[PDB]
Scaffold this active site. Structure first.
Site, PDB file in Angstrom:
ATOM      1  CD  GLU A 148      25.085 -24.484 -27.022  1.00 27.20           C
ATOM      2  OE1 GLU A 148      24.449 -23.400 -26.973  1.00 27.20           O
ATOM      3  OE2 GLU A 148      24.464 -25.605 -27.068  1.00 27.20           O
ATOM      4  CE  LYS A 197      26.005 -28.209 -25.759  1.00 30.42           C
ATOM      5  NZ  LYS A 197      25.114 -27.676 -24.723  1.00 30.42           N
ATOM      6  CB  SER A 218      22.454 -29.532 -26.209  1.00 23.16           C
ATOM      7  OG  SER A 218      22.650 -28.242 -25.696  1.00 23.16           O
TER       8      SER A 218
HETATM    9 NA    NA Z   1      29.600 -20.940 -24.416  1.00 20.67          NA
END
Ligand code: NA
Ligand SMILES: [Cl-]
Ligand SMILES: [Cl-]
Ligand SMILES: [Cl-]
Ligand SMILES: [Cl-]
Ligand code: NA
Ligand code: NA
Ligand code: NA
Ligand code: NA
Ligand code: NA
Ligand code: NA
Ligand code: NA
Ligand code: NA
Ligand code: NA
Ligand code: NA
Ligand code: NA
Ligand code: NA
Ligand code: NA
Ligand code: NA
Ligand code: NA
Ligand code: NA
Ligand code: NA
Ligand code: NA
Ligand code: NA
Ligand code: NA
Ligand code: NA
Ligand code: NA
Ligand code: NA
Ligand code: NA
Ligand code: NA
Ligand code: NA
Ligand code: NA
Ligand code: NA
Ligand code: NA
Lengths: 275, 275
Positions: B145, B48, B45
């Site tokens: 993701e 992001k 992450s």
């Molecule tokens: Na997703």
């Protein structure tokens, strides 16, 4: 009749690139329908129903109030897993009631709540045995959510036939498993479910009571979504009930189609039983 | 001095069964520390942040208000993935502002928000290129993701060196990338982050300002947790700032230890810079 309804469902399935298991069982009346029921379908989150049964039975038998609290460690709240509890309590390390944890695990499908409860109840084997001893064969409970997340095939160790599911749902709905108060609690929790609004519920009239539990896998590198499931008990307009379980397994279809398969099948059953 | 701080960190790492990358860069002053920086660490992450930069730059350059709204399809909200947005809007099929989506994606690490935004901005390659053209080498952005979730090794295609990260954080903090107002917005969003409270923030004084973004993998069948990361900009007591990035990769340690490695390293840096 049942045979014609079955044929309709089978015809519907002919062009869906998935292996779809269906079972239906009337609660009060003697209706029964099975499609592709002899396969072993991965459960994913649908086994949080079974888990809740085992947990509430333990709380009943040991005389432990659902308002008593577990200490939830931050390590109990794993990251990068579906978990409304973790977003609500990002620091963890706090006391949460069995009630709060069960509601999140069942109604919101919390993956961390699930594993917290498996640890409380004594592990996957305890739950597997508990279910088996209710007299419902053909359910296998072997892996926690953490374990499933470690390797693709582990989800298939948590398997069921669809008819086992509705047998279990019927024993439940008739309050043959739990105390009255634990039954009432789990039933309310299943009606309060917020996941899968376009699965069993998707094409039924607005406001239809659907006490249910979803399950969903991820997808692999070949485009296969192992599991898109929904199981529950539905209230008919005359107040009677049916149990239904749909497992859309090993699907090459996109998620909208997988959900729609559940919704359409359920709608077909609904339409037949209301007629 | 910096060399002694570096030696302390290296000594600390000697008994941790993980490969840990560290970089630090002063914002206003000329401080620099790198440990194990020439490896390629999986971001999870943490990218992001990079995504939000690219999205806000597109909104700036194309004159699109952050209050304008995307239609988020139910299919955009995948199940069995970390996603506070999906729990808030379980039916999907609704209009959500770029602002709302960015806040959830960054501050709450939403996996579905992330992919919604990748689709908006034009895909992973657009973001990869955007970052590369800021003049920061050694970052690779290749997989959404959803894509990471399909196969274990795909996360390693989203890689960085730790020093690239802090170079990028510094360009950001000095408002060299975005409009003033988009910079202000993303900075607020990074301070509002609720994930990883026991990572960079974990051992710093209560109330320390830490504008950050976490990243976390799952674990495989061999017990390896690929990524436990936290990156950000921290405000010192005299109002100056440092950028820091810690990547605990390929770890055999349990999650409490992996988080603590970040917290302790950060605390060591903090203590040195406040002295
Ligand atoms: Na997703
Ligand atoms: Cl809430
Ligand atoms: Cl019962
Ligand atoms: Cl909210
Ligand atoms: Cl900027
Ligand atoms: Na009935
Ligand atoms: Na029946
Ligand atoms: Na059959
Ligand atoms: Na069967
Ligand atoms: Na509480
Ligand atoms: Na809840
Ligand atoms: Na878990
Ligand atoms: Na069984
Ligand atoms: Na699995
Ligand atoms: Na069976
Ligand atoms: Na419901
Ligand atoms: Na629902
Ligand atoms: Na439903
Ligand atoms: Na298939
Ligand atoms: Na699929
Ligand atoms: Na500085
Ligand atoms: Na510097
Ligand atoms: Na070095
Ligand atoms: Na480097
Ligand atoms: Na809105
Ligand atoms: Na948010
Ligand atoms: Na680069
Ligand atoms: Na991956
Ligand atoms: Na570099
Ligand atoms: Na924060
Ligand atoms: Na935080
Ligand atoms: Na932190
Ligand atoms: Na290791
Ligand atoms: Na590990």
């Amino acid at each position: 009749g049942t045979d014609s309804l079955k044929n309709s469902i089978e015809k519907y399935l002919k062009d869906k690139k998935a292996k779809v298991g269906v079972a239906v069982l009337g609660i009060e009346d003697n209706f029964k329908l099975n499609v592709n029921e002899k396969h072993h379908y991965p459960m994913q989150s649908t086994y949080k129903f079974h888990l809740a049964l085992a947990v509430l039975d333990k709380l009943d038998k040991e005389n432990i109030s659902v308002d008593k609290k577990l200490f939830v460690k931050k390590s109990d709240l794993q990251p990068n897993t579906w978990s409304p509890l973790k977003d609500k309590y990002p620091n963890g390390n706090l006391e949460l009631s069995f009630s709060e944890i069960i509601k999140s695990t069942v109604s919101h499908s919390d993956n961390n709540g699930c594993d917290i409860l498996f640890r409380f109840v004594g592990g996957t084997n305890k739950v597997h045995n508990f279910i088996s001893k209710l007299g419902v064969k053909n359910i296998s409970i072997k892996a926690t959510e953490e374990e499933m997340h470690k390797a693709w095939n582990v989800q298939y160790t948590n398997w069921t036939t669809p008819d086992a599911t509705v047998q279990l749902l019927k024993k439940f709905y008739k309050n043959e498993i739990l105390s009255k108060n634990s039954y009432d609690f789990l039933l309310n929790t299943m009606i309060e479910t917020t996941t899968g609004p376009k699965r069993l519920k998707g094409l039924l009239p607005d406001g239809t009571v659907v006490a249910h539990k979803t399950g969903s896998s991820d997808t692999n590198n070949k485009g296969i979504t192992a599991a898109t499931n929904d199981i529950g008990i539905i209230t008919l307009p005359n107040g009677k009930h049916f149990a239904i379980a749909v497992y859309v397994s090993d699907s090459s279809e996109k998620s909208d189609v997988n959900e729609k398969i559940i919704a359409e099948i359920c709608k077909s059953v609904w339409d037949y039983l209301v007629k």
